[PDB]
Tab-separated table of C-alpha atoms (C1' of nucleotides) and ligand atoms in Angstrom:
chain	number	residue	atom	x	y	z
A	2	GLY	CA	49.860	70.965	87.789
A	3	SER	CA	46.756	73.109	87.396
A	4	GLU	CA	47.498	74.690	90.781
A	5	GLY	CA	50.021	77.432	91.617
A	6	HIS	CA	51.839	79.798	89.261
A	7	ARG	CA	52.092	78.750	85.605
A	8	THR	CA	55.258	78.234	83.610
A	9	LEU	CA	55.701	78.195	79.844
A	10	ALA	CA	56.963	74.615	80.098
A	11	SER	CA	54.225	73.168	82.318
A	12	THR	CA	51.088	74.574	80.655
A	13	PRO	CA	51.937	75.134	76.953
A	14	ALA	CA	48.344	75.504	75.745
A	15	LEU	CA	47.666	78.266	78.278
A	16	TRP	CA	50.194	80.675	76.781
A	17	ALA	CA	50.040	83.089	73.868
A	18	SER	CA	52.880	85.083	72.421
A	19	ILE	CA	53.394	88.630	71.243
A	20	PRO	CA	56.117	89.316	68.639
A	21	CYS	CA	58.730	91.081	70.746
A	22	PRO	CA	62.526	90.769	70.517
A	23	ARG	CA	64.482	91.138	73.773
A	24	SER	CA	66.147	94.122	72.105
A	25	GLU	CA	62.782	95.877	72.331
A	26	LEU	CA	62.072	94.719	75.904
A	27	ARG	CA	63.754	93.056	78.883
A	28	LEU	CA	61.329	92.046	81.637
A	29	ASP	CA	64.121	91.529	84.170
A	30	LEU	CA	65.307	95.081	83.540
A	31	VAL	CA	61.908	96.792	83.595
A	32	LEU	CA	59.579	95.139	86.097
A	33	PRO	CA	61.720	95.211	89.225
A	34	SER	CA	63.419	98.522	88.481
A	35	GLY	CA	60.996	100.751	90.349
A	36	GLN	CA	58.575	101.873	87.629
A	37	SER	CA	55.897	99.513	88.934
A	38	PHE	CA	56.250	97.691	92.269
A	39	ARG	CA	53.563	95.096	91.567
A	40	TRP	CA	55.528	92.413	89.725
A	41	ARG	CA	57.251	89.494	91.396
A	42	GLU	CA	59.432	86.876	89.682
A	43	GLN	CA	57.697	83.830	91.198
A	44	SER	CA	59.510	81.384	88.942
A	45	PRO	CA	62.824	82.078	87.276
A	46	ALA	CA	62.200	84.227	84.168
A	47	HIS	CA	58.485	84.316	84.996
A	48	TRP	CA	56.999	87.537	86.346
A	49	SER	CA	53.553	87.744	87.906
A	50	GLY	CA	51.357	90.676	88.815
A	51	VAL	CA	48.124	92.538	88.190
A	52	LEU	CA	47.755	94.030	84.743
A	53	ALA	CA	44.405	95.608	83.911
A	54	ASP	CA	42.461	94.093	86.854
A	55	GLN	CA	43.639	90.558	86.033
A	56	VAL	CA	46.584	88.451	87.127
A	57	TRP	CA	49.198	87.608	84.509
A	58	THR	CA	52.493	85.817	84.269
A	59	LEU	CA	55.023	86.992	81.729
A	60	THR	CA	58.195	85.409	80.426
A	61	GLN	CA	60.139	85.787	77.215
A	62	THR	CA	62.289	84.021	74.673
A	63	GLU	CA	64.761	85.634	72.296
A	64	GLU	CA	62.037	86.951	69.999
A	65	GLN	CA	58.774	86.371	71.847
A	66	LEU	CA	56.896	87.725	74.846
A	67	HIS	CA	54.812	84.846	76.217
A	68	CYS	CA	51.717	85.705	78.215
A	69	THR	CA	49.251	83.875	80.446
A	70	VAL	CA	46.259	85.267	82.355
A	71	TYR	CA	44.308	83.921	85.341
A	72	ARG	CA	40.692	85.039	85.543
A	73	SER	CA	36.172	80.651	84.181
A	74	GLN	CA	37.845	77.601	82.599
A	75	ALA	CA	41.568	78.164	82.040
A	76	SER	CA	42.453	79.208	78.475
A	77	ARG	CA	45.073	81.089	76.447
A	78	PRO	CA	44.788	84.907	76.456
A	79	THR	CA	42.497	86.433	73.849
A	80	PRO	CA	43.755	88.904	71.205
A	81	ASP	CA	42.018	91.721	73.064
A	82	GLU	CA	43.460	90.685	76.420
A	83	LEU	CA	46.849	90.432	74.718
A	84	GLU	CA	46.396	94.000	73.508
A	85	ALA	CA	46.134	95.065	77.129
A	86	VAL	CA	49.710	93.862	77.440
A	87	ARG	CA	50.996	95.653	74.329
A	88	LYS	CA	49.378	98.835	75.615
A	89	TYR	CA	50.927	98.454	79.100
A	90	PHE	CA	54.406	98.138	77.562
A	91	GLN	CA	53.762	100.694	74.810
A	92	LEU	CA	55.064	98.217	72.254
A	93	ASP	CA	54.182	100.623	69.460
A	94	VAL	CA	57.096	102.788	70.580
A	95	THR	CA	60.268	101.379	68.968
A	96	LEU	CA	63.080	101.280	71.548
A	97	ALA	CA	65.518	100.666	68.700
A	98	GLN	CA	64.627	104.008	67.094
A	99	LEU	CA	64.887	105.843	70.416
A	100	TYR	CA	68.044	104.062	71.503
A	101	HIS	CA	69.589	104.948	68.145
A	102	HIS	CA	68.716	108.604	68.403
A	103	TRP	CA	69.916	108.916	71.990
A	104	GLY	CA	73.062	107.014	71.114
A	105	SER	CA	73.932	109.358	68.270
A	106	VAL	CA	73.573	112.518	70.380
A	107	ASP	CA	75.184	111.088	73.516
A	108	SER	CA	78.396	109.054	73.316
A	109	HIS	CA	77.861	108.045	76.925
A	110	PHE	CA	74.376	106.694	76.300
A	111	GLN	CA	75.775	104.786	73.350
A	112	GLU	CA	78.320	103.289	75.751
A	113	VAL	CA	75.695	102.292	78.346
A	114	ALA	CA	72.978	101.228	75.895
A	115	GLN	CA	75.095	98.321	74.629
A	116	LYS	CA	74.840	96.434	77.951
A	117	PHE	CA	71.260	97.439	78.803
A	118	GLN	CA	68.938	96.936	75.857
A	119	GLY	CA	65.160	96.775	76.165
A	120	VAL	CA	64.477	99.350	78.895
A	121	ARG	CA	61.153	100.910	77.970
A	122	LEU	CA	58.468	102.657	79.995
A	123	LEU	CA	55.246	101.172	81.296
A	124	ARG	CA	52.107	103.129	80.852
A	125	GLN	CA	50.631	102.783	84.216
A	126	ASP	CA	47.288	103.610	85.756
A	127	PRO	CA	47.057	107.131	87.268
A	128	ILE	CA	45.747	106.101	90.681
A	129	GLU	CA	48.063	103.137	91.174
A	130	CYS	CA	50.980	105.200	89.929
A	131	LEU	CA	50.120	108.257	92.034
A	132	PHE	CA	49.834	106.464	95.351
A	133	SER	CA	52.746	104.141	94.651
A	134	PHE	CA	55.223	106.946	94.102
A	135	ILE	CA	53.739	108.823	97.043
A	136	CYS	CA	54.953	105.824	99.026
A	137	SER	CA	58.314	106.137	97.238
A	138	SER	CA	59.531	109.480	98.654
A	139	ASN	CA	62.687	109.260	100.829
A	140	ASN	CA	62.616	105.479	100.549
A	141	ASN	CA	64.108	102.403	98.800
A	142	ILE	CA	62.499	100.093	96.256
A	143	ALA	CA	62.482	97.105	98.623
A	144	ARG	CA	60.435	98.856	101.345
A	145	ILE	CA	58.204	100.528	98.766
A	146	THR	CA	57.442	97.177	97.153
A	147	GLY	CA	56.508	95.929	100.606
A	148	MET	CA	54.247	98.792	101.626
A	149	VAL	CA	52.453	98.809	98.279
A	150	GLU	CA	51.749	95.124	98.748
A	151	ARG	CA	50.163	95.508	102.198
A	152	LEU	CA	48.252	98.562	101.026
A	153	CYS	CA	46.637	96.442	98.308
A	154	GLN	CA	45.942	93.463	100.566
A	155	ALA	CA	44.325	95.768	103.104
A	156	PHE	CA	42.335	97.977	100.766
A	157	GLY	CA	42.468	96.299	97.412
A	158	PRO	CA	39.841	94.044	95.768
A	159	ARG	CA	40.799	90.377	96.115
A	160	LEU	CA	41.499	88.898	92.685
A	161	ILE	CA	42.796	85.313	92.655
A	162	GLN	CA	45.079	83.137	94.742
A	163	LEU	CA	47.984	81.197	93.261
A	164	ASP	CA	49.895	78.948	95.645
A	165	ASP	CA	50.070	80.911	98.895
A	166	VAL	CA	49.813	84.303	97.199
A	167	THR	CA	46.547	86.221	96.957
A	168	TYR	CA	46.451	88.920	94.317
A	169	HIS	CA	44.653	92.182	94.995
A	170	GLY	CA	43.619	94.909	92.589
A	171	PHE	CA	44.822	98.405	93.439
A	172	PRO	CA	42.634	100.246	95.993
A	173	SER	CA	40.092	102.747	94.688
A	174	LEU	CA	40.030	106.412	95.738
A	175	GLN	CA	36.943	105.806	97.874
A	176	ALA	CA	38.761	103.071	99.778
A	177	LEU	CA	41.953	105.052	100.296
A	178	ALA	CA	39.832	107.990	101.422
A	179	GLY	CA	37.901	105.944	103.981
A	180	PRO	CA	37.530	106.624	107.701
A	181	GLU	CA	40.538	105.556	109.783
A	182	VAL	CA	42.644	104.474	106.821
A	183	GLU	CA	45.627	106.540	107.923
A	184	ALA	CA	45.679	104.643	111.197
A	185	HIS	CA	45.587	101.354	109.334
A	186	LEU	CA	48.264	102.442	106.865
A	187	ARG	CA	50.379	103.480	109.815
A	188	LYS	CA	50.096	99.945	111.215
A	189	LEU	CA	51.096	98.642	107.805
A	190	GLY	CA	54.262	100.693	108.132
A	191	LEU	CA	53.700	103.381	105.504
A	192	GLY	CA	55.338	105.727	107.994
A	193	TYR	CA	54.576	109.437	107.791
A	194	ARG	CA	53.292	108.706	104.291
A	195	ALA	CA	50.215	107.096	105.816
A	196	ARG	CA	48.737	110.570	106.035
A	197	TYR	CA	49.889	111.569	102.562
A	198	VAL	CA	47.912	108.696	101.085
A	199	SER	CA	44.780	109.440	103.086
A	200	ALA	CA	45.050	113.205	102.617
A	201	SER	CA	45.557	112.901	98.862
A	202	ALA	CA	42.734	110.403	98.332
A	203	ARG	CA	40.321	112.823	99.998
A	204	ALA	CA	41.875	115.856	98.340
A	205	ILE	CA	41.294	114.268	94.932
A	206	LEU	CA	37.758	113.168	95.706
A	207	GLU	CA	36.542	115.911	98.049
A	208	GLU	CA	37.959	118.975	96.284
A	209	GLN	CA	39.382	118.250	92.841
A	210	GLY	CA	36.744	116.483	90.777
A	211	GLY	CA	37.801	112.968	91.648
A	212	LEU	CA	39.037	110.286	89.277
A	213	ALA	CA	38.118	112.360	86.215
A	214	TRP	CA	40.272	115.337	87.229
A	215	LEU	CA	43.250	113.008	87.359
A	216	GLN	CA	42.504	111.262	84.086
A	217	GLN	CA	42.080	114.689	82.504
A	218	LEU	CA	45.768	115.504	83.015
A	219	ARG	CA	46.631	112.725	80.584
A	220	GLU	CA	45.607	115.217	77.883
A	221	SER	CA	46.970	118.385	79.477
A	222	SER	CA	50.495	119.727	78.918
A	223	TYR	CA	53.358	118.379	81.001
A	224	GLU	CA	53.442	121.945	82.353
A	225	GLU	CA	49.811	121.910	83.446
A	226	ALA	CA	49.953	118.371	84.871
A	227	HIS	CA	53.128	118.719	86.899
A	228	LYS	CA	51.618	121.924	88.285
A	229	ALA	CA	48.274	120.295	89.108
A	230	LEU	CA	49.835	117.233	90.814
A	231	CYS	CA	52.048	119.196	93.233
A	232	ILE	CA	48.849	120.429	94.904
A	233	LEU	CA	48.510	117.016	96.548
A	234	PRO	CA	49.895	116.089	100.016
A	235	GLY	CA	53.107	114.082	99.786
A	236	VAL	CA	53.506	115.084	96.132
A	237	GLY	CA	56.483	117.261	95.252
A	238	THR	CA	58.416	117.887	92.031
A	239	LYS	CA	60.135	114.533	91.778
A	240	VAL	CA	56.987	112.560	92.594
A	241	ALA	CA	54.919	114.792	90.315
A	242	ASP	CA	57.535	114.004	87.663
A	243	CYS	CA	57.511	110.204	88.008
A	244	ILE	CA	53.705	110.318	87.658
A	245	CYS	CA	53.720	112.545	84.547
A	246	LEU	CA	56.302	110.277	82.941
A	247	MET	CA	54.899	106.834	83.670
A	248	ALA	CA	51.153	107.469	83.809
A	249	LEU	CA	50.256	110.773	82.148
A	250	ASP	CA	52.050	110.277	78.815
A	251	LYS	CA	54.552	113.090	79.306
A	252	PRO	CA	57.750	111.415	77.980
A	253	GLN	CA	60.000	114.457	78.470
A	254	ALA	CA	59.367	114.494	82.228
A	255	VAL	CA	62.720	113.804	83.869
A	256	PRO	CA	62.535	112.688	87.518
A	257	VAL	CA	65.475	114.222	89.412
A	258	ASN	CA	66.835	112.791	92.661
A	259	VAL	CA	70.152	111.710	94.137
A	260	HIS	CA	70.305	108.942	91.556
A	261	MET	CA	70.226	111.386	88.662
A	262	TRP	CA	72.725	113.698	90.347
A	263	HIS	CA	75.170	110.823	90.579
A	264	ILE	CA	74.566	110.045	86.930
A	265	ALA	CA	74.920	113.681	85.878
A	266	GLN	CA	77.982	114.449	87.955
A	267	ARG	CA	79.866	111.219	87.355
A	268	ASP	CA	79.075	110.689	83.675
A	269	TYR	CA	78.648	114.236	82.371
A	270	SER	CA	80.749	116.274	84.799
A	271	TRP	CA	77.555	118.236	85.355
A	272	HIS	CA	77.209	121.339	87.553
A	273	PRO	CA	74.365	123.796	88.175
A	274	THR	CA	75.134	127.054	86.344
A	275	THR	CA	72.195	129.466	86.488
A	276	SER	CA	71.554	128.267	90.036
A	277	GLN	CA	72.675	129.521	93.445
A	278	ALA	CA	73.490	126.190	95.139
A	279	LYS	CA	76.150	123.577	94.375
A	280	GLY	CA	74.061	120.610	95.466
A	281	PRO	CA	70.434	119.426	95.162
A	282	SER	CA	67.947	122.280	95.627
A	283	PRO	CA	64.629	122.974	94.020
A	284	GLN	CA	66.359	125.392	91.625
A	285	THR	CA	69.263	123.060	90.783
A	286	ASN	CA	67.011	120.036	90.270
A	287	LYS	CA	64.905	121.901	87.734
A	288	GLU	CA	68.095	122.829	85.914
A	289	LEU	CA	69.289	119.212	85.838
A	290	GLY	CA	65.932	118.120	84.455
A	291	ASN	CA	66.229	120.738	81.731
A	292	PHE	CA	69.788	119.677	80.994
A	293	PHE	CA	68.721	116.079	80.373
A	294	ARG	CA	65.814	117.326	78.316
A	295	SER	CA	67.907	119.358	75.928
A	296	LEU	CA	70.393	116.493	75.826
A	297	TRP	CA	68.054	113.635	74.917
A	298	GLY	CA	64.958	115.368	73.593
A	299	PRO	CA	61.151	114.761	73.782
A	300	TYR	CA	61.666	111.281	75.242
A	301	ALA	CA	64.276	112.449	77.759
A	302	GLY	CA	62.234	110.673	80.400
A	303	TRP	CA	62.567	107.317	78.669
A	304	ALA	CA	66.319	107.800	78.273
A	305	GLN	CA	66.459	108.608	81.961
A	306	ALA	CA	64.737	105.299	82.679
A	307	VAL	CA	67.514	103.514	80.828
A	308	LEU	CA	70.329	104.999	82.910
A	309	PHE	CA	68.449	104.983	86.233
A	310	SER	CA	67.795	101.290	85.600
A	311	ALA	CA	71.500	100.694	84.963
A	312	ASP	CA	72.350	102.729	88.091
A	313	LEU	CA	70.436	100.285	90.301
A	314	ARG	CA	72.527	97.545	88.734
A	315	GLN	CA	75.716	99.187	90.069
B	30	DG	C1'	62.575	134.265	97.656
B	31	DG	C1'	66.027	130.434	98.731
B	32	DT	C1'	68.013	127.100	103.232
B	33	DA	C1'	68.525	123.724	106.945
B	34	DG	C1'	66.847	120.162	109.310
B	35	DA	C1'	63.047	116.603	110.791
B	36	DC	C1'	61.025	112.531	109.111
B	37	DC	C1'	58.612	106.371	109.268
B	38	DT	C1'	61.301	102.271	108.356
B	39	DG	C1'	64.644	99.036	107.934
B	40	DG	C1'	68.804	96.861	105.338
B	41	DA	C1'	73.566	98.265	104.845
B	42	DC	C1'	78.117	99.544	106.675
B	43	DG	C1'	81.505	100.098	110.250
B	44	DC	C1'	83.198	100.583	114.746
C	28	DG	C1'	75.769	92.793	118.084
C	29	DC	C1'	74.544	99.197	118.498
C	30	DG	C1'	74.795	104.189	116.622
C	31	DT	C1'	75.401	106.576	111.432
C	32	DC	C1'	74.178	106.583	106.549
C	33	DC	C1'	70.939	106.113	102.712
C	34	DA	C1'	66.944	104.892	99.913
C	35	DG	C1'	62.855	106.936	93.474
C	36	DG	C1'	61.704	113.578	98.718
C	37	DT	C1'	58.279	116.549	100.810
C	38	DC	C1'	57.077	119.790	104.160
C	39	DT	C1'	57.928	123.441	107.160
C	40	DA	C1'	59.914	127.017	110.118
C	41	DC	C1'	63.151	131.070	109.156
C	42	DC	C1'	66.274	134.693	107.694
D	15	CA	CA1	68.122	110.989	101.603
DNA sequence: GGTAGACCTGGACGC
DNA sequence: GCGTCCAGGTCTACC
């Protein structure tokens, strides 16, 4: 009863709600779609993970987003804790307004948006987001979710244990940068990315200013940021893009990869024009990103999230 | 300045 | 049941 993961039904007094219609958010369409790989649907409709150094369980009803946090006596979340949630989901941004705009300038989006409401963007933590997507290159969401889990168990701060699951906070830069980490990561199966993680942790700390440098980009231009990030080992244009979009507040950043090419080609009959190649190339990718930008606007990145999400559901 | 592979890993085809 | 193909790409020789 008081043990294991909570459920709205079983521990009523331990939950608190945030006004939020499904139309403005769909947990099942956001949390497992590859923005963040730290959420797991332990119970049906209930998602658990680490949000702001604490473990939470989220679930929703037609017009409410019910929350519950595990920290010392169990109690409903506090208004300030609850704000951590609203901030993480950027609830101030009205998906309805965005969806409307995109829908009016793109008949196709209109078409797709009907069956996929509530796809918004999470505003993630720089570090967690940087190393997660570093693990994402040339890989699939299932493996990624796995690696990121082991990485946190191995180098993350132990939070709490629910049932047979022990939650860890995301590793710090110091930890990731530690002696012999690459070896360890390699045993955890991070593949050739083991080195990217280690190399980047050190690069950030031992030659870029450390955590502050990174957090500084959140105020720099998408241009600056994307530029700055590519410096890092394992970080290219696409990865630098996912990070700008989901952690650095650059909503026009449009991650381009095979997924987007399939979307572009199949639903827009898109082709590179001012580019040499016919297929994916650094020059063609940039073009595609620009295409989607001029199509959707300042929040092109968010619109991208909507389709990319629906492309995983194909 | 732009290309063509090589690449950890492991579930998904297809022979 | 065994070799391709592919997944939230990046990095590196090479013409
Ligand atoms: Ca590939």
